[PDB]
Amino acid sequence: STDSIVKASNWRLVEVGRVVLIKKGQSAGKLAAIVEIIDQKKVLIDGPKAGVPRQAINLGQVVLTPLTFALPRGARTATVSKKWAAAAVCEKWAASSWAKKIAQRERRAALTDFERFQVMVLRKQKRYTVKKALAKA
Amino acid sequence: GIREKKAEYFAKLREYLEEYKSLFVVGVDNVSSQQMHEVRKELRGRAVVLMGKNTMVRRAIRGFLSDLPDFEKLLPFVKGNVGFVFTNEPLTEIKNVIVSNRVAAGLTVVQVYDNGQVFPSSILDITDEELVSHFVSAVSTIA
Amino acid sequence: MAHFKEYQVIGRRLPTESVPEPKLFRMRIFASNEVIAKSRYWYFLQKLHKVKKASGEIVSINQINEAHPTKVKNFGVWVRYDSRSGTHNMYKEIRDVSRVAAVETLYQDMAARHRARFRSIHILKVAEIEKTADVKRQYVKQFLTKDLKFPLPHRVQKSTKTFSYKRPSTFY
Amino acid sequence: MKYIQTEQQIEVPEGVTVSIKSRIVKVVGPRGTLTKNLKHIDVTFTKVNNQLIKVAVHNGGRKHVAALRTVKSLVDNMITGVTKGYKYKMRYVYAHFPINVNIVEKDGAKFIEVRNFLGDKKIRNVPVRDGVTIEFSTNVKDEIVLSGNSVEDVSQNAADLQQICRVRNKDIRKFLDGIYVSHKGFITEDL
Amino acid sequence: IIEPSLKALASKYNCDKSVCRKCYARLPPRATNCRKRKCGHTNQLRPKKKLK
RNA sequence: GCAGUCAAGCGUUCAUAGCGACAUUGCUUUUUGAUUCUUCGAUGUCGGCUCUUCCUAUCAUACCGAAGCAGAAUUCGGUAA
RNA sequence: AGAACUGGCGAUGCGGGAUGAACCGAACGUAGAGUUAAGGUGCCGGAAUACACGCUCAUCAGACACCACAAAAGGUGUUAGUUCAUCUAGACAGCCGGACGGUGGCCAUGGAAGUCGGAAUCCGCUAAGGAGUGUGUAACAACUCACCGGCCGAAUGAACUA
Ligand SMILES: [Mg+2]
Ligand SMILES: [Mg+2]
Ligand SMILES: [Mg+2]
Ligand SMILES: [Mg+2]
Ligand SMILES: [Mg+2]
Ligand SMILES: [Mg+2]
Ligand SMILES: [Mg+2]
Ligand SMILES: [Mg+2]
Ligand SMILES: [Mg+2]
Ligand SMILES: [Mg+2]
Ligand SMILES: [Mg+2]
Ligand SMILES: [Mg+2]
Ligand SMILES: [Mg+2]
Ligand SMILES: [Mg+2]
Ligand SMILES: [Mg+2]
Ligand SMILES: [Mg+2]
Ligand SMILES: [Mg+2]
Ligand SMILES: [Mg+2]
Ligand SMILES: [Mg+2]
Ligand SMILES: [Mg+2]
Ligand SMILES: [Mg+2]
Ligand SMILES: [Mg+2]
Ligand SMILES: [Mg+2]
Ligand SMILES: [Mg+2]
Ligand SMILES: [Mg+2]
Ligand SMILES: [Mg+2]
Ligand SMILES: [Mg+2]
Ligand SMILES: [Mg+2]
Ligand SMILES: [Mg+2]
Ligand SMILES: [Mg+2]
Ligand SMILES: [Mg+2]
Ligand SMILES: [Mg+2]
Ligand SMILES: [Mg+2]
Ligand SMILES: [Mg+2]
Ligand SMILES: [Mg+2]
Ligand SMILES: [Mg+2]
Ligand SMILES: [Mg+2]
Ligand SMILES: [Mg+2]
Ligand SMILES: [Mg+2]
Ligand SMILES: [Zn+2]
């Protein structure tokens, strides 16, 4: 294999349309979209569908997701909304294991005591047939 | 002093668009100082050449788009090593002086100006191999 | 000095014998509350005209909110400031989404780079730069290119718990 | 002022391939193969195509950005050395005592040994680095010529031999003796 | 002895340099500043004195 | 007592190789003074002898850089107690 | 060493300044609950290895009033800034082309034509080309620069401020 092989490190980019998970604060847990770049540490984000108000944010308190969609620099909320919808962003998001893990996390946290109990009894039943399978091959 | 000099360059250029009524855009790629000096001697009568820097021409032309706006469509022919030959004589006696005289191992022509029209320097040297038949190769169509 | 606010401060000399109704003057002032705003009005008004507040009054205080607070813009900032050895004039650019933002980082910057505390700094003029590429300072100009995008290498996730059972990764 | 992105370019001539992983550059051309550990510098490599590789420094300042250009040059000399190769010539310079130079070896060593230096009874020895080869010119008086795939190991070996001849306790303006590098060039492509 | 071009060679190492007027450091002939941190990177250089 | 900044001069010529005036910034606490805080119901007051250890502003010895370093001799400087 | 007004110490503990008469905070019956001051919150040590924008790498870094020192003088470290100048009539840099005619200009001498060397430094033609930057020949050649241009596309030089 005589090619030049250069391990091309593949970063999430801060760019217009890069969608981001908001980490801290009033809009914690929600998805926004980068609209314009302010400086090396600040951006202007907007998350119309999610209910996060258009604002300047410190790139610190937001986490870049791999999701990025088509959006013209500096777009107003209204069209930010129009394009995100068009882009089926939310759909792609909820499809990621990142998204699902968040929700599983969310679900366990919700279990009542009794519920929690049942999970044990079922985990017990599934283990039986699993140890069984295991001990056969 | 460079404000002075440049200003005058437009002057001796603005004065060659009003004087002469036609213009050759030549492609003096290579073509030494000596060679270029001798084409001056071989055009001393009618013609005159004026070599210029491009970004001073493409701007001075646009800045002359008042009177003589026909010269506007020179610009897409002012790239590369170019020069200006102004004249009043016919085509194939000036261009025949230019393209021919002096060479080794000769400056070319890239386009021609006339009354707000352009000539590929090829359609200015017709060898009458269709100029005669223009009233002959269709004259038999009338009979 | 905290979260800054901009104030229209308007005042006039007190009325008199010869001048019933004297001339109103206005300043725009970046201060963090009204009490400072009005005090910084009288500071300058002592230095420009020769009013003392004892012989004047403050006709109005109004907060000047930012027009388009969610539109990123490039501000030009003119500053007079005092140093350990002299007093100087400056110009700098700050890219932000509001006037009040711009000033906060101006005041921080003057303090990091030149060790200038609030007191040693007059804000001369702060004005949006309408025509891009009137932008003079590079550290802003490099954000103005078409299709700008950059990565954010070496990401350090803050840990909650004190021990972790996996050797972390910095992989944004 | 912290530069948002700044990059450099490395032309990969025909014949040589270059593979890079965790910043350990491997370079194979006709002459053979050279590797370098550039891990000590945060530069990120990207291959545009087998002809051209780019080197970038993201969000870096003055000095960080300064490491970029030198990284390019390092990867370049890797390449040219693995194609044109390197060749330093030297010259014995002596006013009265002829400098006798030879290759000896102890335990398959190969040292450059140097004798009679300014009338010295001491026998100097410069080890010959691996990968660099020492020849003696045949039409140039007192020449000596080191050559090989890396400038680095060649240049050093040359400097190594020239250092060993420094002249102590004499006005070194008068006593010019030594072995000095007289030409730096390639193996292919003229001399 | 030693032909002019070899004298010229060995001068490129021994004679054609500059000196720091603070710490005597032997420096590149076109040098503007001294490399040594001890003399505070001074730019008070002189040329290495040429022989007879 | 020691060390700097300036560079008029010295140095055949050439400020600074080695020096450096008129001025000026310092450092030190083996000088001398100034003070009088401690001891006057008592800290034995010079020199030497003996012995240990410390400082470095290095006289020698190691390795260097510099010169008005040809060699020899020397001088200036660095790392060095 | 000696005066001035006030506040202290002395006569006074307490919290802070590790330490300490005199600083900061605050003055004191025996106690409970709360809140603070000055000062702190990596660990010693009660209290965010909090948040945010910068700056700094010291083979002698630095780290908080009183306070346990530093100066004239200097740095092509690095940051921000100032002024003059150049540049969209296209600079700077980088590559690439041309680098001409009177003319081997004049004296000089084995010879010396731009370049051992004396005296000037004129002109033409020019977009530009010195009676010549250097390499070079015995002397021409040959190469080369200053100068102009083809491309590139927005910055570049110099002096400074802290
Ligand atoms: Mg001041
Ligand atoms: Mg002030
Ligand atoms: Mg010596
Ligand atoms: Mg000697
Ligand atoms: Mg050298
Ligand atoms: Mg040192
Ligand atoms: Mg001298
Ligand atoms: Mg003298
Ligand atoms: Mg002397
Ligand atoms: Mg006493
Ligand atoms: Mg007693
Ligand atoms: Mg006793
Ligand atoms: Mg007794
Ligand atoms: Mg010492
Ligand atoms: Mg030394
Ligand atoms: Mg001398
Ligand atoms: Mg001698
Ligand atoms: Mg002797
Ligand atoms: Mg002697
Ligand atoms: Mg001395
Ligand atoms: Mg000892
Ligand atoms: Mg008091
Ligand atoms: Mg008493
Ligand atoms: Mg008290
Ligand atoms: Mg203390
Ligand atoms: Mg007080
Ligand atoms: Mg402890
Ligand atoms: Mg604690
Ligand atoms: Mg270092
Ligand atoms: Mg103070
Ligand atoms: Mg500085
Ligand atoms: Mg200006
Ligand atoms: Mg550049
Ligand atoms: Mg060339
Ligand atoms: Mg050229
Ligand atoms: Mg001559
Ligand atoms: Mg000659
Ligand atoms: Mg010639
Ligand atoms: Mg200033
Ligand atoms: Zn030095």
Side-chain angles (χ1 to χ4, degrees), chain A residues 14 36-38 54 63-64, chain C residues 70 72 95 143 149-150 172:
Chain A
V14 2
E36 200 169 59
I37 290 180
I38 308 204
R54 188 184 228 232
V63 30
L64 308 181
Chain C
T70 70
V72 185
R95 190 162 151 97
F143 282 103
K149 36 210 199 150
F150 53 90
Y172 232 178

Side-chain angles (χ1 to χ4, degrees), chain D residues 119-148:
Chain D
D120 261 12
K121 252 48 181 170
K122 197 211 165 55
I123 334 148
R124 295 164 221 271
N125 294 275
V126 169
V128 174
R129 267 126 198 281
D130 270 23
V132 17
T133 94
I134 276 71
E135 320 174 25
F136 289 54
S137 293
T138 165
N139 33 353
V140 180
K141 172 66 158 303
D142 297 330
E143 177 121 79
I144 237 265
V145 175
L146 312 94
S147 42

Side-chain angles (χ1 to χ4, degrees), chain B residues 66-84:
Chain B
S66 314
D67 53 324
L68 51 129
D70 302 332
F71 290 80
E72 200 198 70
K73 282 299 180 172
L74 274 278
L75 307 180
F77 279 132
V78 82
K79 251 270 173 278
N81 261 280
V82 284
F84 280 151

